[PDB]
Structure formats: C-alpha cells, structure tokens
Symmetry: D2
Subunit: 387 residues, 4 copies
C-alpha cells in the first residue's frame, strides 16, 4: 500500500521551496544555496511534474544580459534532460530594499514604474519557458501605520498596474493568465487584498476581468482563522481557481509554510475532496519551507512527504464518496435537497404558496435532526482507515 507520485499527478514546487537556506528573522542560513539545475534533477527523481520560479531565483539580481542568457540556457538544458515543465512564474517585488514600501503601490511613483518594468521583463521569460499562469503576490503592499497609505489611492494604483499588465499581454498575443495571491499580513503589518474574498472582489473592477483569477495558499487564509476549503469553493463557484499553493499551518501565527498534510489535517482532507470532486485540473503546487533544522536529506524527505500526503488524502476522500453508507448519510442530512432550487416555480408561485408560510409547520421542521455528527464520524473513520 504505497503512494508513488508520477508526472501525471501534476505536482510542482517553487525553486525557492527546496532552495530555502533557512534564514529567519532570528537566524542565519543553515543550508548552502542550491543550484536550480540540481533542484530540477532531484525533483524529477521524486516524481514531480515541474517547477516554478521568481525572476530572482533563476537570474541573480543585477545580472547583465550575458549572464542572464547563460542562467536561462543552463536551466533549459535541465528541463530538457528531465522532461520537467514550468507551468507558472512570478516576480520578486519584495526582497530588494527598493521595495520596502511596495511594488505596485509604493508611495514613490518612480518605484511603481520600475516594478512594472521588472514584471514585464519576466512575463516575456515565463512565456518563452511555457508558463500558462503568472502569479502576483504583493507581499510589500500594505502598511504598519494608518497614515502611511491611503487605501483608496493604493487600490487605484493596484488597478492601474494590473490593467497595464493585461494591456501588455493582449498586445503581445500571449496565452498567459494572472493569478493574484492573497496574504493577510507578513511582511507588512496588514497586506492589501488580505484574503481570497478581497482578491476576487478586486478582480471584478479590472478592465478585463477574464484574464485574472486567484492563487490561494492554505496557510494564508488560515493566518486569518478562515476555512480554506470554503474559500476555495467560493473561488471555484466564481470560475476563478487558476492555481493553488499547498502547504500546512498551525493556526494564527507567523506564516509557517510546513509541508502539505502538516498543520490542519482535517482541512487538508476536505480540500483534497473538493479539488478532486470539482475536477480542478491545474498544477498541485507546493509553496513550503523544509524546516531549518534539516540537512539536504531532510529537504528531499519533506518534499516527498508533500506528494505522499496528497495521494493518501486523495484515496481516503474517494473511498468516503464511494461508500454506500456515506451516500445514504448524505441523503439523511439532506445534501440532495441543498442542490435543488428553493424556488424554480418563481416568485409569484412562492408568494401564493401557503405551504411556505401560512400553513408551514415550523415546529415539525425544527424537530428534524440534521444527522451531521453521524456523517462527520463516517468521514473521520474514512480518513483514519478505520473504514
């Protein structure tokens, strides 16, 4: 009873994940830097389907056009040697000090123009390597104090930047869509577009809303104490689940980025149940950090655990949905009824229907138990293999 990933499972990792050196707010790096070529080779051996990158992970900041081309050629040869793909790319608009007050919403206009230029340069590269999605995480957009940022002005600036990127992609005829990734705080005291809901609402005000979706991260919605699977169902309902970041988090605290399955395990089960039942077909991307207590062996074990945990949860959710006893429990809890329209008969029919009010027996309806605890215990039995 083994669970082996194959490239067909669509598992992807950022270069910055297995490549994290372990530098935290309180400590120095515990591991040497990894050459991107080595990460591509090691991930291919574990069964991953591909990798993602920020511009700065692949081409060191400040590289001349000569070194740039060299870094790209070497990477490209590693992808050719292993069959690994690059489904998503993003920009680093958070490390360099110039971004201390943001990229797209920095108060300084000069920095905002620079941020757009750095981004556009990377979209060209992403298209060349075949990415289908371009993510945007505005980690420096926000503030630590109230007077430092007028948020209405900041959203105008954020809209302006995304509308210019949409103009660029359409002008070039590229087949690439954008995915905004929300985070409530860290590194800024409060970050703009803090949750999936805030990001979905913002997209509706862009000039071409169809080019943009969300890239939610498990641990970021949990940093606000929200239900991850409910946020994802809202993103699927809106047709905006363009990409996803998988990891684990233990509650409202700093962003841990533990391997997928760590953190809230029941949430991980319901998330896999939802992705598989809704037919999500994008990459299963892991944005995690092998703890700094680990050496290289531990990095590879942590990345392998990410894939393993998804495969086990996939099997348990499938057995759960397939069990006839569960199907009867879902009927007993009226899941079937939730799926039917409340009033396909229309407004006038509802208004004339005495069974909906005048003669509705509230006490009989109220006495009906929901049977949700029997259903939840079947789900627990299935996750634990005690079924």
């Amino acid at each position: 009873m083994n669970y082996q990933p194959t490239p067909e499972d669509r598992f992807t990792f950022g270069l910055w994940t297995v490549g994290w050196q372990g530098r935290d707010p309180f400590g120095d790096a515990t591991r040497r830097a990894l050459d991107p070529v080595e990460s591509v080779q090691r991930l291919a051996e574990l069964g991953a389907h591909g990798v993602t990158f920020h511009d700065d992970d692949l081409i060191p900041f400040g590289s001349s056009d000569s070194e740039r081309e060299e870094h790209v050629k070497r990477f490209r040869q590693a992808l050719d040697d292993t069959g690994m793909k690059v489904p998503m790319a993003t920009t680093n608009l958070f490390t360099h000090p110039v971004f201390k007050d943001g990229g797209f919403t920095a108060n300084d206009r000069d920095v905002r123009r620079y941020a757009l230029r750095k981004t556009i340069r990377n979209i060209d590269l992403a298209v060349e390597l075949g990415a289908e999605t371009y993510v945007a995480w505005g980690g420096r957009e926000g503030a630590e104090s109230g007077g430092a940022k007028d948020v209405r002005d900041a959203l105008d600036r954020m809209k302006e930047a995304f509308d210019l990127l949409g103009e660029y992609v359409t002008s070039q005829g590229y087949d690439i869509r954008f995915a905004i990734e929300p985070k409530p705080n860290e590194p800024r005291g409060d970050i703009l577009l803090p949750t999936v809901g805030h990001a979905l609402a913002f997209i509706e005000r862009l000039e071409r809303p169809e080019l943009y979706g969300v890239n939610p991260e498990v641990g970021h919605e949990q940093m606000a104490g929200l239900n991850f699977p409910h946020g994802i169902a809202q993103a699927l309902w809106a047709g905006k689940l363009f990409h996803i970041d998988l990891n684990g988090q233990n509650g409202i605290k700093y962003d841990q980025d533990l391997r997928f399955g760590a953190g809230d395990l029941r949430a991980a089960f319901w998330l896999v149940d939802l992705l598989e039942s809704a037919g999500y077909s994008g990459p299963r991307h892991f944005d995690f950090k092998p703890p700094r207590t680990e050496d290289f062996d531990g990095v590879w074990a942590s990345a392998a655990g990410c894939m393993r945990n998804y495969l086990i949860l996939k099997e348990r959710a499938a057995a759960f949905r397939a069990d006839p006893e569960v199907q009867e429990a879902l009927r007993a809890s009226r899941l079937d009824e939730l799926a039917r329209p409340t009033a396909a008969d229309g407004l006038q029919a509802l208004l004339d229907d005495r069974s909906a009010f005048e003669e509705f027996d509230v006490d009989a309806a109220a006495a009906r138990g929901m049977a949700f605890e029997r259903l939840d215990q079947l789900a627990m039995d299935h996750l634990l293999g005690a079924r």
Copy 2:
C-alpha cells in the same frame, strides 16, 4: 469641552441593543425586557436620530394579525411623539429552532421557502415605516462539519434567495436597497460570506448587483484579525458602503459587541477619519450590548458613551487633517504621490521610458526613508490631545 449628540449626527441603535436582557451561553437574563416604546423615548432623550429592528423585536413571533397591528400602532405613535426615524430594518432568521441549519441555505427546502416568506412580510413593514436599507445577517448559514454543507450548492441557494428578494422589490416599485452583513463564525462554526471581501464578491454574481451593498460590523472583521478601516475603504472604493455597524471588540474571541470606542481605540480613530473624509452619509448605527453586569442606568450610560466616543474621535481626526504640520508630514511620506497615476502616459510610454528601468537608480530610491513613524506619532499626539 462637551460633546452632545443631536439628531443631525444620525446616530441610530437597534431595539435589540439597549433591549438585550443579558442571556449568554452560560447565564440567565440579568435585566427585564424593555417595551420598544420605552427604548424609543429614552434614546430620543439621549439625542439619537432613530432606531432599527428585526421583525421579532417588534412583533413577538406567532402574533396574530390583530396583535401585529397593535404592536405597530403603538410603535408608530412613539415615533410620532419623539421625531425618531427608522432608517433600517432586518429579519430574525436565527432564533427560532426551525432556523438551526440556516434560513436561505438550510438543507431542508421547506425551511428555505419559509425563510423567504418571513423576510418578504418584513420588507413590506420596513417600507411602511420608511426604512431605506434592509439588512441581511445570515448568522445560521454555515456549518460545524465539512460534509454537512456543500458550499457551491449553498451559494447557489443564497444567490437564488437574494435574486428573488430583488425581484420582489422591483416588482413592488420599492425604494429600498439590501445590505449583507458578514460575520466569520458564531453561532455556526464557520459562517458563509465571512468577511466584507467575501460579501462584495458574492454581490457581483447577483442578477441586479446595484440593489446590494454591505453592512460591515467593526467587531466581526476583527474576529478574523482584519483591519476594519482597510475593509471599509475597499467597500467605499467599490461604491458599496450602504450602512455600518459600530461597536468594539477586543481581538479574536467570541463576538463582544462592546460600546463603540471600547476595544481597539486606534482602529476607531482611523475608521472615523475615513468615514468623515470620504463623506459617508448613512446612519451611524450602534450594534452593541451593554454588559450583563449593568442595570438600566448602565444601559443608558453605555448607549450615551457610544455617541460621545464617535464625537470625540471626529474632533481629533478633523484636527489631525487640518494641522499644517500633518499636511507637511503627509507630503514628506509621499501620500500626494500615491494619489497620482503611475502611468497616465500609457503602456507604450512606460515601456520606452529608460528612467523606469534601464537607468532607474534602485539604490537611491531604496535609501529614501518613508518617515511613517513621525507621521504616526503626530496622529497619536492628536488622538490623545497632546496636540
């Protein structure tokens, strides 16, 4: 140096606020029930502009049409005697046991039809009494376990219900708009549309989005650790701030509903700064609960404190914005620059502008300090009257 409210300040209170008997999950009521007529009279004496109600606060559940009319006539006479208005009304779809699994999203179809009928009956009453806004708080919509609610089906049901209410209002020619009020949890384990962002996004999928806005509550966004003034700026940016619920909360815990100004005082200051500077012209509604430790004297002192605290914050934010030293600090922090377009010159101009990339001096830009702490201390000096 006194701060007296007058009806011109637009301060409103729910009957359920000063009328809360003090029953909590762990204890019996500490105060006798108040007759709505008495609350109208006492609030008019403190300087309030009006009151709001849930159908069940005014007409006891189960009342025959005869008692209904009687409860309304008496209320109407109290409004005439004091000059108090009724700017908002709402429905109780949470107390009666029939609503244990929700109103609009209950799994039982019969309950969902009943919920719509109970709501429609109250919209007619609200219009008769002159309300301009009808709020919807789906406190029972959500779940305690994963299998109990398919959220995509639940959002279809929630959309269906709001679309039918929109059809009803337009069919009757009423001048009333709806305001959805988000809450992340309590009484359900997780509530649907948990934050202002989730509610704004949902409204964009309704058949007539222009009839719906949000009614955010200070304490509810703080229950998710979010920045209230940032959520309100997003609601104003979208043109959807239809009404607001003012109160205080000390962090992520049960919903406290303390008087306005209690809880996060700095957030209260920035919220008042924003409402007044954006020109919000709706009611300043207090949805709070005088602590159960209080007698009737304490209820009235708590409600008076609500208004007083808003008036003091209003004065301090106005002195803050009016101070020439603050105006120079805002320029020093580049608030002026955040308000200017990043690229009014257009995409092609940005792409050809070498000053935005090729010749951008990142190090010089990065070395520029934001001066946000000097600005924040001026704001602190102003709030404390140490300026």
Copy 3:
C-alpha cells in the same frame, strides 16, 4: 476492527454535556431537558464508567431540603442499577445572576461568602456519592474593563477562598482533592488564571498546595492558541494532572466543545500518546456539547464518537511507539540524548571541560540535521493507518 468502550476504559461525561438543550447566545433550546436518571442509563449502555455534575444539574436551584433528598435518592438508585460511579463533582457559580461579577472574586463581599457556602454544601454531597476530585471553574471571575477589578486584590480573594475550602476538607477528614480549571475568556472578557501555567503558579501560593491540581480542557488552551499536549506535559512534570476535560475546538474563537477527536486531530493524537505513555490513571472525562442541530439520536452518536475516537488514537499511538523503525528514528533525532543530564559531572567539571567551549566545534555540531521531518512523517503514517 472495532473499538468498544468498557467501564475499564474510565470514560466519564458531565450531566450537562449530553444534557445540553442547545441554547446559545443567539438561539432557543432545540432539545427538551433530560432527566439525570435517563442520562445515567443511556451512558451505561454506551460503555461509560461514570458521570459528573454541578450541584445545579442534579438539584434545581432553590429546592427545599425535601426535594433535594428526593433528587439524590433517585440519582443514587440509577447509579446502583447500572454500576456507574461519580468520580468528580463541581459547583455552578456562573448561571444565577447573583454571580454576574464572579463567585469567589465578586466585588460584593456578601456574594463571595454566599459562593463559599454553596460550594461547601456541594463538597459534602460529592463525598457522599464518592467523588475523589472536586473541580473549580471560575467562569465569572474576571472583567470586561480595566478599572472594574484590581487583579492583586482579586487573587488575594481567590487565595482566601481556596485556603478556606482546604481548611474545611482537612477539618472534616475528607479524601477529596481540588482541581482548578483554566479558561482564557468567555463568559467574561478576560478570565483570571487563564491557562494551565497561570493555575499551576497560583497553586504554589496556597497554604496547602498538595490538595490542589489542575483540570485542563483541550479547547480552553487552544482558545489562547497554545499547544495542549505541551501544557499537559508541564502539568504532569509538576505532579498536578488531577483530572482532564476532553473535547475538540477549531482554533481561537468561541468555546465550541465539539466531541473529542473533532477540532485539532493531530493534537488529539499527541495528547493520547502522552496520557498513555505517562500512565495517567484518572478519568477520561468528556466536557462537550452535541451540536444544537442534533436530535436525541445525534446526542448519543456524538457521545459514542468521543469514546471511539480516544480508542482509535490509543491504538495508533501504541503502534507508533512500538514500531522498531520509529524507535530507530527517535535515536536518529536524539530523543535518547534529551533524556540524559547535560551535566551530571557538575558545575566545576563543566567549567574545566574544554570540549564544551574552547574546543567545541560549533560548525560540525550545527551541520548535523535533526531528522525531525522523517520522524513526523512516520507519525502521520501511523495515525492514518498507512502503516
């Protein structure tokens, strides 16, 4: 592969758990009251070992001595008929309005004397029914505002009350110990002795510290975002784990009291691992509330799930500790070394040991990986039965 509880498993429940009518801050009861005799009989049938009670759960507040004796005789006959025991008892010092500002720390001296009298009356009853532990949950001790309670004065009053109860027990020659149960908030804004640590520290200032221990609750330490199993290890380290309250909670929010195993499942696994490995021999008490969505069938299914979940976790933690591959992993992570004294050689020997400083190779030591992720994945494999 079934998991049947027997009285030998020591599973206990409060009358107030399966007896919760479902009244919440926002809603009326959804279930009729249960006669204590019926709960005793139903729990005996599910395999429980016993029940616990607050004075007010067994004898309705205000009962004359005649009704009191009657309520006791009936209960006593049900215990005799089923073989159920009563290992713990407690006092209700939170429901009646008189307790609105606390019991032992109320500002009114008269209420504090009354609280002690009500408690003493119940200790006599508890001893008569054979309880070995008397719990104290000061749910009303605390405040919603800063000036309302001087905490140093409040701790003097709390010490005085516990010292008088200790004097009473010793004077009567009773074999009963006290267990203080911490809760950070709810129903008060902030409760005194908010966590296990605060309660252990307070006990050290009592006149006879040996008579007092703690009764930690899973969900209460999680309401402060703390690690439950770490708090329990500290209570075991101090020799103060007198009783325990088992349930589930999903994070920092209102006190949910879900059935045990719900909430943080990994925490539940590590807690069972610790109770069983440390040899905890007290009752396994469930302080939970079957959700108000349930009818009587759902109440009994929820209580049965509590016991089932403990039994499954017990089996998985035992298989985890018994696996030779886990034993080698623990050695690989140096768990063996953590158990050895750092300096049994003494201070002078450590000071003269050049291998501890002057010649310590920090870089070699730092490069050693902890292998914690391999170990954690083995634990995950074991919990899920994927091992």
Copy 4:
C-alpha cells in the same frame, strides 16, 4: 505641555533595537550596521538612562580574546563619556546555526554544554559592567513537530541549566538575578514556557527560586491573545517582576516589536497605571524594532516616541487615580470591597453565618448593578484628555 525624558525616568534600550538593520524573513537589510558607541551617544542625547546587550551585539561571534578586550574598552569609554548604565545583559543562544534545535534544551548534549559555557562567560562580563539582571529568552527551545522533543525531558534539561547557573552565581558571590522571558512561538513552532504563567510555575521547581523572576514582554503575551496588565499583576503578586520589555503589537500575528504606545493603546494605559501604582522600580526597557521603512532619522524618532508615550500615559493614569469623581466611581463599583478579606472571621464563623447562605437574599444582590461602564468611560475621558 511637553514630556521630556531624563535619566531619572529609567528608560533603557537594547543595542539590538535601534541597531536592527531591517532584515526580515522576506528581505534584506535596509540600514547599515551601527557601532555600539554611536548608539550609546545618541540614546544619551535623547534622555535614556542606559543600554542592554546580548554578548554577540557587543563582541562579534568568534572574536579572539584580544579583539574582545578592545570591543569592551571602547564601549566602557562611551559609557564613561555619557553617564549611561548597563542594568541588564543577556546571551544570544538563537542566531548561530548550532542553536537550531535550542541552547539549554537542544537534543545534542554537546550543544547544551556549549550553551552553558557561552552564558557563563557573559555573566562575568555583565557583572563587570554592573548589570543587576541577567535575562534568558529561550527562543530556540521548542519544536515544529510532536516527536522531536519530549517536553518532560526538555524541562528536566531546562531546570538543570538554570540550577547550574544559580550554582555559578552563588559560588562567585555575584549580586545578579535571572529573569526568564516567555514567548509563545517564533522562531520555533511552539516555544517552551510560552507565557508569564508557565515561566512563574517553572521557577517554583528550581533549587533556589529566589534568584529567578520574569522579564515579560508586552507583544509576547498579546501573541497568545492574553491581557498583558493581568499577567503583570500576577507577576507582581508573586514578587517576581524583575524586569519588563515594553513595545507594541497588533494582535495574534508575527512578533512586531512596534514602539511602545503603538499596538493596543488602552492596554498600554492600564499597564502604566499598574507599574506606577505598584511602585515598580526597575528599568523601563524598550525591546522594539524601528520599521525597516525607516532611515536613521526615523530610528531616533521611533526611540524618542517610546519614551514620550510612556510619559503621556503616566500623566493620564495619575490624573485618573487622583480625580475625586473617579474615586467615588471606584467606591460605586465596590473596588474597596474587593480589597477586604471575604472571611477574616474564619471558617467556623462563615459556616455559622446564616447571612452568607440560609438568609442570603440572592435576588437583591443580583439586582445590584456594577457601574463598570461609567467607570470605564471616565478612564477613556482621562486617557484622551477629554477630562
């Protein structure tokens, strides 16, 4: 109406506070390193009384005995030139990779011995420079996973280390006491002794408890959602408030370390009220980080704000306690009664007192209002200078 600090106010700062370069988990330093001599001079000019240090802030890790002496001589001359003192010192047992699994509780025994040696070397230096308090923050003691640390073994190791340090100090005849500083998480997933309560309880198990107290930090207890002033009153009640770390934090999130007065302003007011009324006479130490958005001018403005905010709160709490109207309100809320013994008459007298039970009028007592909201509004009026 100015608030100027003087050395008599006892304001102190760590070298690491104004010296923070701005490196965060997501970004590079934004400011150049400061020479400790320059910080001493600048702080003396702002009115500080002294500075504190970790060994590594003063003498770069790895320095030979020759460079060590040089770093000390230069520092010593700056203290002589300005009249600044050094009231506290501490050890860095968290930055170097060797400490990745902790100092005193690392699984590797060799690292634990090294940690003690590094600490002892610094206690000698601290005594030489005149420190009266030696702080211990075990930031790396804890874990990210359950199996990685047996907590009972870890507490044995932590007790062993503190007992050896106590043996060393007494053996040398030094007049220095230890202060343990709690933090619930960050950098480890969960840190041992997470709150003031956990640290006070642990001290009671040391061989010489009188040598140890706590160094609580505002932002750390708030990271667990706890009430800072209540934790401090418990530490004062126990006679263990040896030192204090002042700063601001906005809720449960990463450790922000904002300047004092930022964060929870009402908590800051009640904390100052308590320190001043209890007569705390130790240093008023600021452990904060000027935001990375700032240049050197902003660093100095942030440090000056720390002192200013304490002085303003000190004035408002003193006016609050001195107001006759407040004194009458405290009597109205029975603060006077909370300070009197509940039963100085003794147990037997309480048991025979019918006024405490048999004839206690619970309904009359329950109807008495606490008048806490009037009292809290007076406190708000006083903090805002609207009084």
